Amino acid sequence: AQIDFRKKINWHRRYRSPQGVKTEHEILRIFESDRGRIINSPAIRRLQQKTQVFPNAAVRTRLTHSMEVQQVGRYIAKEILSRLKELKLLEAYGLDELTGPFESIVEMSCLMHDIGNPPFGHFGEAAINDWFRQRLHPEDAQPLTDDRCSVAALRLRDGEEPLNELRRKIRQDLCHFEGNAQGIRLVHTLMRMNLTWAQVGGILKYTRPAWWRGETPETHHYLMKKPGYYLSEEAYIARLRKELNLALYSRFPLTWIMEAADDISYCVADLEDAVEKRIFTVEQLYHHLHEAWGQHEKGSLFSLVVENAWEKSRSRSTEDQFFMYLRVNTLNKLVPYAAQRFIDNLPAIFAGTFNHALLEDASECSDLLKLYKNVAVKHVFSHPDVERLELQGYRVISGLLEIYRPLLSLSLSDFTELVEKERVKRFPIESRLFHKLSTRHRLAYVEAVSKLPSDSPEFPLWEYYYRCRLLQDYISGMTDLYAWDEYRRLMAVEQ
Amino acid sequence: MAQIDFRKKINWHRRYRSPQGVKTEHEILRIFESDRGRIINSPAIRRLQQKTQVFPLNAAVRTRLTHSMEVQQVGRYIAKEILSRLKELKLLEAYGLDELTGPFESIVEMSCLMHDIGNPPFGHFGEAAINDWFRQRLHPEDAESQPLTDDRCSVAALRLRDGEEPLNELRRKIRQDLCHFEGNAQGIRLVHTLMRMNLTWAQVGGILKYTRPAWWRGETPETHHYLMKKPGYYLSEEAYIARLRKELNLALYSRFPLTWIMEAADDISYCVADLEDAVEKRIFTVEQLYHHLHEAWGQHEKGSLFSLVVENAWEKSRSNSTEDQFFMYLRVNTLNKLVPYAAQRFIDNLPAIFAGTFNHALLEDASECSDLLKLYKNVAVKHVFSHPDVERLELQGYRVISGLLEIYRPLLSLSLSDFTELVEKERVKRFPIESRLFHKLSTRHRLAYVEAVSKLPSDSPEFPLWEYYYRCRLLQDYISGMTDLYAWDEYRRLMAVEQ
Ligand SMILES: [Mg+2]
Ligand SMILES: [Mg+2]
């Protein structure tokens, strides 16, 4: 009915939660604790070894990117906050004592959107999903006696009907690995950071279950674009919506802000990087921009942003000057536009239902972002080198999956034996493969499986699910270099 | 009964195109935000992600960037605790900080983020290499007082000729200064002359960690021994630093307040991180570490600092993976005892820290806290930095930087006219090698050279000296600007060891 941010900035935790009535200061310190938790996480440093667009120190990695993004998100936050202050609406919306947490949650959400991304990015994603799709064929789930699923337990046997449904969800879910979903899993089950509910909400960018099949509801198309959470994170996400008063398939407000921030940074950075990596020159870039635009009315957005960037940078290095100004001008037009977009739609963004991005529009601003994106896609991401690396990464991840396949091939009893006894005599290979998986991952497997009723007819299905989930955890946790090196060492191509 | 007005220290003016007049709280906030945007998007910061911290680059092992980032958070924590400790004492308004909370914390955070910015490849050993090479060329020893017959300086213009006395002094300062390359001094130079970020005066003050001129000779004043420990600025940054002290009301050889905060932060992060890293890189195990700590400490009054911090970390860990738990708790406990102690230390000495004269660190003490930091440091120095691998890499880096210096030596060997000719004509016919070497130097560096030299009166007897100075300064700029990997690869390429 209203807008009360005290009911959205939830400073409680999942375990050992702070309790009762807290002062402004004590809430501030709670969210500070969240900051210290995240910044000192292994997952963040691991970001410094994952590649952004290219694989050259001045070229950005997911860390320095996430860091520039952090600053853009903070800028947007502050502008929203003080535009609400100028409208004398802070107290009205419950934000008068939550300024700190507001900005901080945005900054940290920015800092860790990339946290759950696999090696080689979208192509590691691809590789994983294609491999598993070849093994599980979620397409074939009415039952067929020619069901191409290679896994005994997950085939649809005619008769058993609830079990068939669980089989459906398991197949689809395992075949929809996604970076964001993996990030929720990572932040909850594998790292056990025990963040505030608000922070976790800040991560949850899409709201579609990975096990989802068919067309998504019309009114939620944008929010259910990609999978947001896995079948295993389900009860946790339910709990999360309960704690942040989110409707089914709805989103946490602050997310929009960070998402906006993301877009902005990445766009200009990519062009800059393309000029460091020599893919095209500055004047050439200015030309591709000027052409792709095309509608030059006197005093439009392109003139201000791009053409003024270009005009200044020609008289102290010209390339750096041009991109500095391009970033500045872009930010100075787009950040307040995003802010205003947020405020003008605050009721629906607060309900978590608003089916649009802040910078998705017929706006000139939106068109400017699309301009940048087009120029990059046409003349940067098509650079033969970028594509070589994409092909390579796909082979490396497909290959690691093939190497560890022996573990997914074991029977329930055999694998359980392997988990319990540690070193099994009649499975030398599978044993050593198993020990190569990370400790945290194996613990997560053990914990998940131990929570299941072992006499239930569902048990073998859930176990296969959590085993595949173990393998995907392990592979998607690697840095590009590590995944590559592991693939080459295991393939006996190097020592 | 001196004064404490932070409005007179948090200077939000700039060197060029400065904002002017009477600004509101909000407009000042935006000024310092601008500073943040300036620094975070600098090439120098990303270059930090490719320079090594203690070990070489695993992923979970820290680099100067992720370190500087963790440091950023510790510095912010200390800042906030000082600020709200002053708020609880009802002293913000009293000290002029009531409208400068944002800038305070922000200046600390960004100073933390870029202390490492001016560091050479291979760290202290790149530093070593540079200074040793140049010392072999300039022998600043022979220029103390009294000119000499046997003056081993290989550079014609900078030998002390008996008679010319002002020139001899300038010669002295040039030799010493070129032979005292330092990361912090290079950072001031980097932030002013090479990057031209045009930060607020307060921010630049935040960088200036030591206050000794690199050209300094002899014992440093007794009352300033800690602040003049290492060189803080180069002979070329001199007029800038003068201007800086004028804008931040600093006495000669004095320091900017907030610096102490960041310095404290630095120490803390690095200490625990290193031990953690040593356990990732397998140098020793956790239980072994606990043992080396417990031994280096001494007996217990089960309730002393070691008990709380380390022993509670170890126990809380033991109830279980174990490694990560132990180091998480170790960091938490250390921070929770040391950060407020640092904060308190800052507030209890605020008059002298504000005067910029306070001759101590916040965590340099007979304090138990201080002793705990020293404990960590000792354990690392004995059982981590002595790991044969770390030392291999130190030796290697020294060879690489010594070698790059030898490769570019032909440029320092040219005469004034010849090098000038090379700068102006670009491609000179009778110097194929030197020409190509020159073009390999970075554009920003060469521009800085040209600008510096153009500022000089060309008919002055000082001119050839200043030019040689700014030329050496050009070479040191170029070499210290490299990442470890780049310096290494360039050295190998240029040596024809690979393509
Ligand atoms: Mg991103
Ligand atoms: Mg440091």
Side-chain angles (χ1 to χ4, degrees), chain A residues 259-282 284-294:
Chain A
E259 172 180 78
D262 182 62
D263 291 9
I264 295 176
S265 330
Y266 102 55
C267 76
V268 172
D270 286 349
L271 298 188
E272 192 181 336
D273 284 341
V275 178
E276 301 181 20
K277 289 274 184 176
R278 279 303 197 266
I279 300 185
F280 44 47
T281 70
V282 173
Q284 290 178 231
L285 171 58
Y286 180 73
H287 184 254
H288 292 143
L289 287 175
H290 199 190
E291 274 294 60
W293 184 254

Side-chain angles (χ1 to χ4, degrees), chain B residues 271-284:
Chain B
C271 76
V272 172
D274 286 348
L275 298 188
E276 191 180 338
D277 286 342
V279 180
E280 299 181 22
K281 291 271 183 177
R282 295 283 201 98
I283 300 185
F284 45 46

Side-chain angles (χ1 to χ4, degrees), chain B residues 53 64 67 71 115-116 266 270:
Chain B
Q53 177 74 356
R64 286 200 182 290
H67 166 86
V71 168
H115 63 286
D116 270 335
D266 182 61
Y270 103 53

Side-chain angles (χ1 to χ4, degrees), chain A residues 52 65 113-114 262:
Chain A
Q52 177 73 355
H65 166 84
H113 63 287
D114 270 335
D262 182 62

Side-chain angles (χ1 to χ4, degrees), chain B residues 171-186:
Chain B
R171 294 173 164 114
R172 278 165 199 124
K173 274 177 278 167
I174 285 164
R175 300 211 224 171
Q176 197 72 28
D177 195 89
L178 289 175
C179 288
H180 280 271
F181 173 91
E182 175 71 39
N184 307 269
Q186 186 62 27

Side-chain angles (χ1 to χ4, degrees), chain A residues 426-435 437-439:
Chain A
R426 61 183 201 284
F427 299 119
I429 303 303
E430 294 88 329
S431 291
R432 306 188 157 72
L433 284 187
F434 188 73
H435 302 137
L437 307 180
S438 303
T439 287

